[PDB]
Amino acid sequence: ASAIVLINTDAGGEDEVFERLKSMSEVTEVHVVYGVYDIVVKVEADSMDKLKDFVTNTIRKLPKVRSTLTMIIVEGKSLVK
Amino acid sequence: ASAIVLINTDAGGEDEVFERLKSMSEVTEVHVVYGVYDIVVKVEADSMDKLKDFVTNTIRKLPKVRSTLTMIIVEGKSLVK
Amino acid sequence: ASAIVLINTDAGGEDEVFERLKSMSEVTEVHVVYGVYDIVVKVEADSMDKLKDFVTNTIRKLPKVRSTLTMIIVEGKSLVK
Amino acid sequence: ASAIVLINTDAGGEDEVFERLKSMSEVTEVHVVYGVYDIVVKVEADSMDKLKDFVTNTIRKLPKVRSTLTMIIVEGKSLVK
Amino acid sequence: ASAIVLINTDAGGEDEVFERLKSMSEVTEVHVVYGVYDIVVKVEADSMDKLKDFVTNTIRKLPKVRSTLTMIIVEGKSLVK
Amino acid sequence: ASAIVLINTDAGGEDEVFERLKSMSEVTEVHVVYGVYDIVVKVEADSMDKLKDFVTNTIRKLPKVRSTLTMIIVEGKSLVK
Amino acid sequence: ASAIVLINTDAGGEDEVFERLKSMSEVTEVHVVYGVYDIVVKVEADSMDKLKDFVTNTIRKLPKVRSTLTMIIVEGKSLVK
Amino acid sequence: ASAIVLINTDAGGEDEVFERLKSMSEVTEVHVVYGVYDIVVKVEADSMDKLKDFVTNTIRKLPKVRSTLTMIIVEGKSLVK
Ligand SMILES: CC[C@H](C)[C@H](N)C(=O)O
Ligand SMILES: CC[C@H](C)[C@H](N)C(=O)O
Ligand SMILES: CC[C@H](C)[C@H](N)C(=O)O
Ligand SMILES: CC[C@H](C)[C@H](N)C(=O)O
Numbered sequence: 001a002s003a004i005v006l007i008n009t010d011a012g013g014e015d016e017v018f019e020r021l022k023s024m025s026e027v028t029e030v031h032v033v034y035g036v037y038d039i040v041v042k043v044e045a046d047s048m049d050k051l052k053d054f055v056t057n058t059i060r061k062l063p064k065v066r067s068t069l070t071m072i073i074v075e076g077k078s079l080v081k
Numbered sequence: 082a083s084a085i086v087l088i089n090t091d092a093g094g095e096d097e098v099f100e101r102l103k104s105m106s107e108v109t110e111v112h113v114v115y116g117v118y119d120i121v122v123k124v125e126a127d128s129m130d131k132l133k134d135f136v137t138n139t140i141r142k143l144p145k146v147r148s149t150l151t152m153i154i155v156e157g158k159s160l161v162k
Numbered sequence: 163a164s165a166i167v168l169i170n171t172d173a174g175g176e177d178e179v180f181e182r183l184k185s186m187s188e189v190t191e192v193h194v195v196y197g198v199y200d201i202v203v204k205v206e207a208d209s210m211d212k213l214k215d216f217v218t219n220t221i222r223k224l225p226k227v228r229s230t231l232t233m234i235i236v237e238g239k240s241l242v243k
Numbered sequence: 244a245s246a247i248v249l250i251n252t253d254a255g256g257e258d259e260v261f262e263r264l265k266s267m268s269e270v271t272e273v274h275v276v277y278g279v280y281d282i283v284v285k286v287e288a289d290s291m292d293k294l295k296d297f298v299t300n301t302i303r304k305l306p307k308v309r310s311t312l313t314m315i316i317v318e319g320k321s322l323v324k
Numbered sequence: 325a326s327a328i329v330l331i332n333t334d335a336g337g338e339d340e341v342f343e344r345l346k347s348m349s350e351v352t353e354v355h356v357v358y359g360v361y362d363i364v365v366k367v368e369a370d371s372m373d374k375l376k377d378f379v380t381n382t383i384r385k386l387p388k389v390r391s392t393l394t395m396i397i398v399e400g401k402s403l404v405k
Numbered sequence: 406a407s408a409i410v411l412i413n414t415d416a417g418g419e420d421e422v423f424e425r426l427k428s429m430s431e432v433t434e435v436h437v438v439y440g441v442y443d444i445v446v447k448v449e450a451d452s453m454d455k456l457k458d459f460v461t462n463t464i465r466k467l468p469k470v471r472s473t474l475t476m477i478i479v480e481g482k483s484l485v486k
Numbered sequence: 487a488s489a490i491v492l493i494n495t496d497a498g499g500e501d502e503v504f505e506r507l508k509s510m511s512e513v514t515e516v517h518v519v520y521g522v523y524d525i526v527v528k529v530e531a532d533s534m535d536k537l538k539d540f541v542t543n544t545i546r547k548l549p550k551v552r553s554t555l556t557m558i559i560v561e562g563k564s565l566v567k
Numbered sequence: 568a569s570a571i572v573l574i575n576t577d578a579g580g581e582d583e584v585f586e587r588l589k590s591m592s593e594v595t596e597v598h599v600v601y602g603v604y605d606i607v608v609k610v611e612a613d614s615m616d617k618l619k620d621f622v623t624n625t626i627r628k629l630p631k632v633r634s635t636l637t638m639i640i641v642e643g644k645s646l647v648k
């Protein structure tokens with residue numbers, strides 16, 4: 001299961017969150033960004049349940065995460081060169 | 082220069098736009114997604130001027146692209162495993 | 163009176179809120195969802211006043227409810243097969 | 244495969260879109276609504292590919308459909324009474 | 325039945341739409357405004373069905389209306405001094 | 406000086422905020438509403454400074470007021486019947 | 487009268503719009519930008535009527551302007567070093 | 568490096584935040600505004616790294632700053648008369 005998750009942090013907590021994210025195997029990329037969202041992660045998990053558990057029970061429970069917006073990727077419309 | 086671009090298309094045009102983007106050398110990854118955005122692209126250009134020229138004169142002049150939201154990725158806070 | 167309520171939760175609270183909602187008689191359906199909203203609920207109440215009281219005094223007083231967006235359904239433009 | 248799709252129509256086209264939506268078998272419920280969205284549909288498709296195809300090539304190609312926001316429902320966190 | 329409708333217009337059409345709205349009996353007040361919305365209107369109709377018909381068939385069929393967001397007012401939580 | 410202010414409260418505090426708002430002389434009308442906003446107020450102040458001060462130091466300091474969106478009404482494009 | 491106006495253009499029309507904006511005396515600054523808006527202008531006009539006329543009758547009528555969001559600046563809370 | 572930052576504060580904190588920002592040498596202009604954002608700041612830093620460090624460790628660690636939206640200004644599409 002694949003998704004891109006847009007994260008907003010508490011004001012000023014973006015670097016600390018990025019640091020946490022780096023260590024997790026399900027996070028295949030992570031970037032802090034300018035604009036309306038603060039961090040963009042690509043998440044690859046073994047199943048849709050494991051994606052859900054990861055989003056709800058890890059990412060959304062990390063210190064200083066405020067909100068997440070998970071964009072489920074369409075199977076067959078996804079390319080990483 | 083690196084950025085993630087959140088694209089909205091005209092309703093129904095997402096597959097057409099996807100296929101256009103995939104063949105562009107500045108586009109390193111592209112995904113159709115469920116939610117408030119339709120396509121997520123990661124763009125890598127040689128310079129910020131070349132990123133601007135790519136976003137404005139290629140991506141945003143594609144048929145059926147309605148809007149774009151470019152998130153400039155912060156140098157030194159960007160990991161692809 | 164009937165409505166669909168889009169709920170946002172505090173980060174990580176969406177399963178808990180989902181569980182509280184599921185057991186309430188006015189809730190005819192409830193779903194955790196990916197994207198900009200966390201929980202969608204269909205509410206059926208005997209009147210508009212009881213809809214009001216349910217939204218404000220039950221839904222919006224649940225722990226870890228951050229926001230709600232109640233969409234009143236139009237009488238005569240509503241089908242459940 | 245199940246989703247709740249939030250639709251905006253071109254101004255004034257909501258009743259016509261509603262009537263088109265109601266006769267589709269993948270649409271198990273459809274409601275015109277007050278607020279920032281115009282119609283709410285629950286879609287039940289046999290698979291995630293059939294969901295994508297119904298969203299992109301049916302819903303998003305209907306006349307007067309301006310935008311959609313598909314919310315993928317979380318398996319195991321979904322109840323219709 | 326009563327509501328406040330937030331209207332967005334096509335760029336440059338807000339004075340024209342304002343003028344069409346002003347003369348209609350269901351409109352009890354109307355204002356062009358700065359910000360994310362263009363026009364605020366208070367609507368008072370004899371019933372919820374007539375509210376519906378007014379929003380969809382008058383407001384949303386006005387030339388240069390792009391979008392509307394109708395906020396139904398809660399009975400018993402409404403004061404005009 | 407006239408404005409329409411859209412208020413969001415902390416979840417569940419809308420009735421308490423409404424009662425506080427209704428006794429203020431600068432508030433000429435106040436309504437709790439369904440949708441993305443929770444309360445709508447029209448504010449009439451003697452001047453733009455008095456508007457600012459009432460928005461910042463009264464409304465935005467009320468307990469359970471989370472955010473406001475003040476829409477400055479355009480002089481000459483405003484009618485209350 | 488002072489304001490900052492956030493402009494969204496038709497996809498790809500941002501440079502052409504920026505070029506138009508440069509020539510107008512009421513526009514004291516203009517910038518194209520990455521993210522959810524496309525151009526940021528500072529507008530200084532002689533009065534609130536002249537601000538309104540400029541926004542509605544010039545900026546919002548320019549080719550390829552799609553939307554504008556005008557943020558009225560608070561007198562006494564405005565500094566340009 | 569140049570950017571315009573759209574700031575939201577805790578309700579009522581806008582004047583406090585304004586006064587904090589005004590004295591910072593990276594802040595070249597600052598305005599409190601009516602609407603969906605509360606403060607607009609223009610930031611000029613010597614480098615993109617210094618912009619990031621300024622946004623994350625100064626602006627977004629100010630008391631009562633709730634969120635920020637940094638719009639990176641496009642080099643060569645930026646005029647201050
Ligand atoms: C460093 C950027 C931060 C996190 C935020 N997204 C902003 O645009 O202000
Ligand atoms: C499980 C998904 C959570 C609730 C949130 N809606 C997201 O998209 O990240
Ligand atoms: C009938 C309601 C329409 C479709 C729209 N959602 C509004 O709130 O104005
Ligand atoms: C196939 C998904 C489409 C593109 C849209 N983003 C939606 O959620 O409805």
Ligand SMILES: CC[C@H](C)[C@H](N)C(=O)O
Nearest residue numbers: 358359361362554555556
């Ligand atoms: C006159 C204002 C126009 C209508 C728009 N609401 C803006 O803020 O730019």
Ligand SMILES: CC[C@H](C)[C@H](N)C(=O)O
Nearest residue numbers: 230231232439440442443
């Ligand atoms: C009673 C309605 C509340 C305040 C909120 N606006 C909602 O739509 O859920």
Ligand SMILES: CC[C@H](C)[C@H](N)C(=O)O
Nearest residue numbers: 473474475601602604605
């Ligand atoms: C004084 C204005 C405040 C900061 C807010 N932006 C509002 O519009 O309500």
Ligand SMILES: CC[C@H](C)[C@H](N)C(=O)O
Nearest residue numbers: 149150151520521523524
């Ligand atoms: C050049 C940037 C354009 C205009 C747009 N704001 C974007 O972020 O895609």
